[PDB]
Design a protein around this ligand. Sequence first.
Ligand code: HEM
Length: 470
Amino acid sequence: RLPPGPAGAPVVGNWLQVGDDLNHRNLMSLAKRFGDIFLLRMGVRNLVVVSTPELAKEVLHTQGVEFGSRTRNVVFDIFTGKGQDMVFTVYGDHWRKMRRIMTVPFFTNKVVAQNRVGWEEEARLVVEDVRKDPRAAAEGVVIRRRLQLMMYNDMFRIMFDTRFESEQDPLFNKLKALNAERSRLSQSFEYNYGDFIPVLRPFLRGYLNRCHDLKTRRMKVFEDNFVQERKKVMAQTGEIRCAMDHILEAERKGEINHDNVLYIVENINVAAIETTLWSIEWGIAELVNHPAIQSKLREEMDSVLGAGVPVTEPDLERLPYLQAIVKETLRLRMAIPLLVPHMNLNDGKLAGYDIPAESKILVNAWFLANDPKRWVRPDEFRPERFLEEEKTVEAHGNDFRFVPFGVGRRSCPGIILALPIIGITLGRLVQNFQLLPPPGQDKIDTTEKPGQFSNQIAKHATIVCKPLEA
Ligand code: HEM
């Protein structure tokens, strides 16, 4: 009836057997013991993990409604207003409304066309700042730091038609720290006792007070420094000139309330910025460690675009090797490796097993994308696979082995923004630098740090960026 799994113990369930760190690696090991679908009890919380494309199809597509909700806990409830946001809402009319209101301002080809030259410039500014850093060509630079500013500027250009001038900008650093604390508080293991053993919830008072205050400070910065300016600019310009203008217009029309507006901002800041950065950083690391692939990419852009001609968004469709490098980075180095948790509001069935209502459903998407029984040597960083035996497999999940952006109703709408940003950024870097390891090393250390939320390079990479002219 229930899926197989390790026998639990009273009130702790499997918590003390498996620990707090549930990631795509040790969930693979459990799948090796218990099969394509297995159950864990984290105290009172049911967790179901599926590890086949067939089961991903069931969770994401065939029963996409039945399993189309999100799990929450007392911490995420504070930050999302108990699902008054977009990401962490259950499936229903609220989610439909939010998803619809966000489509025109954020997630169309027109949004891409209106923002691509900003993305292209922010990428060029990364190159210029690294190009002038004396360390970059010598011991190397931790390039994700400058790329972080690029991601902030790309996303705040879309949201508010604004950017941050430098890594030293006070507002940029204030916002960065609030976003970091927002995610640290929601991803910390230290509140698990009160979620898994709910009778202990009173002892979380202090932790939850900390979450309240963080939300207060973070929403205040969103409001004071970005949202209120748009109301002012909207009134004086009389028009709708950025994504969040559309959102505020929906509030003015009475379709949403101001809390919904701020939760959209809250969502984009945790869903879009560091997430894209992880893939860019991973791709840089693998390009350093695969010089032949790096040179082949550089040759593609020179051949297709011409020498010295910068890559732009409309060029990506005629740079299939660049696109394949991006897909292979999302495959081998999938940085959101368990997607986002799904949840069934009502009792359901998967693979014939009964799934209790409100179970947390995890798709091990990294494993789907790296299963040696379903891919040709997935351990290799081989972008050519997406030009050869995988040449029809795309990032939007037409093949249920490769679902880095999900599939179906709860799939990532930001795919339309992430893919061009990654491609432009990697292309621009390779057009201007030889990407090399630091002098004392032959390779970038690509050891994973797998967690329930992200699969980041464990050590932020120090990259030597040697100008091609040097
Ligand atoms: C490489 C970068 C990114 C990756 C790999 C990624 C991946 C994902 C995944 C796996 C999900 C959940 C799929 C599921 O629940 O089955 C998701 C959801 C979401 N993503 Fe992204 N994403 C990226 C960038 C972005 C960006 C740039 C934005 C917005 C500008 C964004 C906005 C969202 C939103 C709003 C959701 C929630 C969708 C819903 O629950 O209805 N993402 N993303």
